[PDB]
Amino acid sequence: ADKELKFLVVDDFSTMRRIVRNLLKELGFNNVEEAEDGVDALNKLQAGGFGFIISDWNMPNMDGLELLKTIRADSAMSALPVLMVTAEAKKENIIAAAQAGASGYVVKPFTAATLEEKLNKIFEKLGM
């Protein structure tokens, strides 16, 4: 199984990036970089090689919904999987994220099992 899949973990909260990085490590993914908002994320992404994004919503500089739309509109990365992991849990917002092309959606607080389950589901949808 491909464990070199390179993840970008985006969240303004250091503890949450640490949680997500540690969980990915458990799953066998050691190629993980971090960003603190959408602007930071877009800079990291131009270094190449990223195969998967896990992103927060509420962040300064550029929020996760803006980030997601930007990625979906870029020919350099239009179909790049983006898992939302966020405290944002209003039905309207979840629908909006989905319509904006989110690959999946996890509400905080979440268990290790939930993250693994949602990542697996995305892999399956894409033939990964």
Binding site: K90, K91, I94, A98, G104, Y105, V106, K121
Partner: peptide
């Protein structure tokens, strides 16, 4: 929404 509510919502959107 709980995670179960999110999953139900996204299932109804075709995920």
């Amino acid at each position: 929404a709980s995670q179960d509510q999110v999953d139900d919502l996204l299932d109804s959107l075709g995920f």
